[PDB]
Amino acid sequence: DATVYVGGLDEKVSEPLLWELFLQAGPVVNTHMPKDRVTGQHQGYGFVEFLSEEDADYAIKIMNMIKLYGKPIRVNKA
Amino acid sequence: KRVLYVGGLAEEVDDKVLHAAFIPFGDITDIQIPLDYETEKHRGFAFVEFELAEDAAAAIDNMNESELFGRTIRVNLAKSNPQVYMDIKIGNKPAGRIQMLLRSDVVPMTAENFRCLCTHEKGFGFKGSSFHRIIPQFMCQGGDFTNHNGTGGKSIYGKKFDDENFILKHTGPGLLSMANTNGSQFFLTCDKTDWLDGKHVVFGEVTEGLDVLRQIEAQGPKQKVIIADCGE
Amino acid sequence: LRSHPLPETAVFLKLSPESAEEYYLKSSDRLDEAAQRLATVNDERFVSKAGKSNYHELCDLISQNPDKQSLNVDAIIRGGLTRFTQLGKLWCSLADYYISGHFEKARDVYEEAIVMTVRDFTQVFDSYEESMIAAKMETASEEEEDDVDLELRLARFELISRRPLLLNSVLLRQNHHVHEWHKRVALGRPREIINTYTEAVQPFKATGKPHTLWFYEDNGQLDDARVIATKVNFKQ
Amino acid sequence: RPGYKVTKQRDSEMGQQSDYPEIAMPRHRFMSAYEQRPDRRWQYLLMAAEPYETIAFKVPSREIDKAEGKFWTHWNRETKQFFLQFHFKMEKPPAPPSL
Amino acid sequence: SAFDLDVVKLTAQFVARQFLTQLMQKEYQFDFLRPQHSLFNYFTKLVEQYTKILIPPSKLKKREVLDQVCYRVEWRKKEEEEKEKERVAYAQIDWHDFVVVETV
Numbered sequence: 001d002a003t004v005y006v007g008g009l010d011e012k013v014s015e016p017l018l019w020e021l022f023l024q025a026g027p028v029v030n031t032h033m034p035k036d037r038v039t040g041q042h043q044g045y046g047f048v049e050f051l052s053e054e055d056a057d058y059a060i061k062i063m064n065m066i067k068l069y070g071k072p073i074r075v076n077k078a
Numbered sequence: 079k080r081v082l083y084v085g086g087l088a089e090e091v092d093d094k095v096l097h098a099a100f101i102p103f104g105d106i107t108d109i110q111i112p113l114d115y116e117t118e119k120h121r122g123f124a125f126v127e128f129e130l131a132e133d134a135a136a137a138i139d140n141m142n143e144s145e146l147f148g149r150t151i152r153v154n155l156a157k158s159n160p161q162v163y164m165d166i167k168i169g170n171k172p173a174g175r176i177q178m179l180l181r182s183d184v185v186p187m188t189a190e191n192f193r194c195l196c197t198h199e200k201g202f203g204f205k206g207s208s209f210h211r212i213i214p215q216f217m218c219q220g221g222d223f224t225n226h227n228g229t230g231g232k233s234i235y236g237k238k239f240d241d242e243n244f245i246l247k248h249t250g251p252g253l254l255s256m257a258n259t260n261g262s263q264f265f266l267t268c269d270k271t272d273w274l275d276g277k278h279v280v281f282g283e284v285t286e287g288l289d290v291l292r293q294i295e296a297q298g299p300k301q302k303v304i305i306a307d308c309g310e
Numbered sequence: 311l312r313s314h315p316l317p318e319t320a321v322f323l324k325l326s327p328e329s330a331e332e333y334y335l336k337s338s339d340r341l342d343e344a345a346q347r348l349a350t351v352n353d354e355r356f357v358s359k360a361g362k363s364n365y366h367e368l369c370d371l372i373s374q375n376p377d378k379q380s381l382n383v384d385a386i387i388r389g390g391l392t393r394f395t396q397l398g399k400l401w402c403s404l405a406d407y408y409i410s411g412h413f414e415k416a417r418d419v420y421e422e423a424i425v426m427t428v429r430d431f432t433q434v435f436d437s438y439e440e441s442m443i444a445a446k447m448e449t450a451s452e453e454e455e456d457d458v459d460l461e462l463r464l465a466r467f468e469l470i471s472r473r474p475l476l477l478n479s480v481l482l483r484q485n486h487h488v489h490e491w492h493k494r495v496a497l498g499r500p501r502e503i504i505n506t507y508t509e510a511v512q513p514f515k516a517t518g519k520p521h522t523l524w525f526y527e528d529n530g531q532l533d534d535a536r537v538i539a540t541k542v543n544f545k546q
Numbered sequence: 547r548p549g550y551k552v553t554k555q556r557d558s559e560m561g562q563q564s565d566y567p568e569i570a571m572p573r574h575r576f577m578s579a580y581e582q583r584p585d586r587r588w589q590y591l592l593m594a595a596e597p598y599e600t601i602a603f604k605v606p607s608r609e610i611d612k613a614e615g616k617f618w619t620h621w622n623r624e625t626k627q628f629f630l631q632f633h634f635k636m637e638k639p640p641a642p643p644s645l
Numbered sequence: 646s647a648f649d650l651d652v653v654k655l656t657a658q659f660v661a662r663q664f665l666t667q668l669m670q671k672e673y674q675f676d677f678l679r680p681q682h683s684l685f686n687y688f689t690k691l692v693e694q695y696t697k698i699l700i701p702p703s704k705l706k707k708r709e710v711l712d713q714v715c716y717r718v719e720w721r722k723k724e725e726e727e728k729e730k731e732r733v734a735y736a737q738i739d740w741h742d743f744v745v746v747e748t749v
Contacts, residue, residue: 072213076273088396090395090396135619138615139614140614141614143613144614145397146397153614285621569730569734573731573735575740582743590745592740594738599744600744602744602746603745603749604747604748605749607749610749622724623728623732
């Protein structure tokens with residue numbers, strides 16, 4: 001479970017408000033939030049690696065309460 | 079399936095007339111007649127709730143297109159295991175009624191909680207609350223009648239109650255399941271959501287008004303979705 | 311009220327004083343119903359009078375029907391007093407019609423004031439000169455079946471005016487029973503002649519007019535011809 | 547009272563010979579003329595089948611044959627109360643009756 | 646629930662053979678005697694069962710057992726599926742492709 005997939009975001013969000021955002025729950029050890037080079041903008045889906053698995057299963061339970069730019073945030077195991 | 083719509087009511091018809099005209103089919107629990115306070119008269123229709131769904135059914139068959147006070151009336155469904163309803167308003171517009179069957183046979187404590195929250199018989203409930211989280215092809219979540227954002231709600235038993243069992247599975251759209259530590263928050267599924275099996279307690283199903291649920295889903299919220307009325 | 315209930319369990323003028331002191335009115339109407347039931351003559355009508363002193367009114371009218379004639383009309387006046395107008399008034403008109411022709415005609419008139427009443431009044435005309443006026447007005451109000459009904463009225467009631475209304479039915483639809491409508495004027499050779507001229511304007515009806523002035527199978531194949539290779543069949 | 551009955555006939559194995567269990571009955575719905583591809587104000591009893599073209603029937607009368615609990619409340623919604631309540635699909639002969 | 650069970654089954658034992666209708670008048674424990682009390686139903690079961698034991702009070706000398714279980718065996722999904730399909734297609738066709746002929 002150490003990693004999660006996160007959908008439905010707005011590009012003003014970046015890797016930092018994800019950092020800050022999910023460490024509110026529990027620390028994101030490895031952050032991945034693609035920067036698209038071609039048009040220089042984000043599609044808004046994320047992958048998160050944690051310290052171990054327990055962090056991330058609690059993360060499955062609590063985790064999908066985040067709302068990025070008035071809008072819904074997908075978090076599921078991976 | 080206990081609530082009936084009754085239209086084509088003459089001005090002289092009131093709650094007493096309705097009680098007398100429908101009681102021959104079975105005991106009645108409630109009669110609502112929307113009023114226009116500027117005129118003090120009703121708008122030509124009402125909702126009659128029977129104790130038993132079977133009696134409501136017999137009434138529809140014998141009273142639809144029958145005569146009352148000289149004119150023809152219209153009777154139809156407005157929208158052992160309890161059946162409850164929610165009338166939904168989207169933006170400023172009525173959307174219709176969702177009717178739900180609660181599986182008291184499988185999850186009695188969970189079904190009873192939701193039933194009471196529909197009737198308000200314990201002093202609080204769903205009326206006027208919102209569907210605050212709506213995700214297309216997934217689910218429509220509501221029941222947070224205290225904080226309106228997914229952090230609140232309360233059960234008839236206290237803040238929280240146990241997961242009764244996970245017998246009923248998330249097999250398709252139109253199922254009722256508890257959000258969660260059960261309180262009052264719940265969701266209506268919009269597809270098979272089997273990844274939630276064993277994590278959320280399923281406790282009922284939509285029996286009428288799947289189309290109204292689809293209208294809620296269409297807002298997944300882009301516009302406010304409100305439980306304008308509810309009951310048993 | 312509980313003392314009134316226990317006193318009711320204990321349960322005429324002094325008793326009426328105890329009851330009025332105990333009060334509520336629905337129990338009194340139930341008591342009058344108890345009197346009307348227990349009496350089941352004139353004393354019951356006196357109980358109805360005391361009930362009038364007490365002031366469902368249609369139910370009182372039903373009790374008045376149980377008392378059963380001008381006094382009944384007075385009870386109808388009480389029913390008129392009960393309300394300005396909805397189904398209970400129709401029940402009053404129903405009792406008025408079931409049993410003084412003016413009593414029914416007036417209720418039929420008030421029913422005419424508000425179309426089902428016009429229908430019941432039409433049934434009253436069907437029961438019957440004035441009813442014939444109501445029926446002819448019902449037909450002339452402005453349908454071919456209804457024209458057949460008015461033609462039946464010509465067959466019953468009452469001739470030139472019938473020829474005029476028949477002219478109206480003819481102008482309304484130049485199609486084959488019209489000669490029969492003309493036949494009422496013969497009551498016949500002339501109406502049959504109208505059936506013949508109508509045939510020219512278009513089968514057996516002219517022959518029936520001839521008998522009036524005085525084979526059905528071939529007439530039926532002819533009817534097959536009268537239906538609106540097919541033309542060859544019309545030839546055969 | 548008085549009710550309407552429609553008898554819709556379909557192809558005689560002429561073109562349906564070219565059968566891959568892809569939704570291989572007709573469906574009816576009451577549509578308000580308020581939405582069209584000028585004038586409006588009446589309903590239509592639309593009837594549809596996959597290949598063939600849609601069909602409509604104007605219903606000026608506010609209500610006809612709108613019954614009251616015909617059967618004894620059995621719940622297979624199919625599509626809606628209208629379809630199960632009052633339609634028949636002779637699939638063997640390809641005749642759709644509606645009343 | 647052992648108490649309730651025991652009293653139900655005992656009053657059921659005696660009721661299976663006037664003693665209860667006398668007990669009720671002689672002595673809120675037996676409140677299940679009225680068809681109002683839910684448990685009453687299960688009562689009607691037990692008694693019946695005991696009534697049955699009185700039937701062949703005769704030995705049972707029952708291949709046959711197998712045959713029987715087969716016959717008992719002998720004594721919806723697809724439909725649901727088809728219905729689902731119908732709902733999908735009905736929801737997914739143009740109700741605005743009108744081409745009417747007549748009217749009633």
